[PDB]
Design a protein around this ligand. Structure first.
Ligand SMILES: COc1ccccc1[C@@H](C)C(=O)N1CCC[C@H](C(N)=O)C1
Ligand SMILES: [Zn+2]
Length: 139
């Protein structure tokens, strides 16, 4: 679990969005596993606007943060799960690291701010849904 809170927006994994997220929907994209909802309170987070390929992510299944080198946002095949059919997920970045069911929503940060959230795992890999291209989150 986990979310980004920036301005009057909440960014979550689309497959973990609640009834309240859907009732306050701003934007969603199944191909990216992202959903953004509106909030009444002002958020706690800053979004990175950069091309960093290293950072640190939070892994809830270890209660620890790990440093990672990750690929640039790209179109990657993701196997079927209970939440999606087998498909290509866009704007996804991969790295070597631990991620299991439950770790989705953990934040990946570089020195400039939030980069994205955990969206895929298994096989000693961890995948992050990028949010750095969503410039409107800042306004
Ligand atoms: C079967 O899921 C796992 C198995 C081992 C390890 C980890 C997982 C989880 C985290 C995972 O990668 N996904 C399930 C939730 C939606 C994800 C997506 N973006 O399509 C895919
Ligand atoms: Zn950066």
């Amino acid at each position: 679990s986990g979310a980004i809170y920036v301005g009057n927006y909440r960014v979550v994994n689309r497959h973990l969005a609640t009834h309240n997220d859907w009732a306050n929907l701003v934007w969603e994209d199944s191909s990216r596993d992202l959903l953004v909802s509106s909030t009444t309170a002002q958020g706690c987070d800053t979004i990175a606007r950069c091309d960093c390929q290293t950072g640190v992510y939070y892994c809830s299944s270890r209660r620890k943060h790990y440093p990672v080198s990750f690929s640039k946002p790209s179109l990657i095949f993701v196997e079927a799960s209970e939440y999606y059919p087998a498909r290509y997920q866009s704007h996804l970045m991969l790295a070597v690291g631990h991620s299991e069911p439950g770790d989705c929503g953990g934040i990946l940060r570089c020195q400039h701010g939030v980069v994205g959230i955990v969206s895929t795992g298994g096989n000693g890999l961890v995948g992050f849904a990028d949010v750095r291209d969503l410039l409107w989150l800042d306004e």
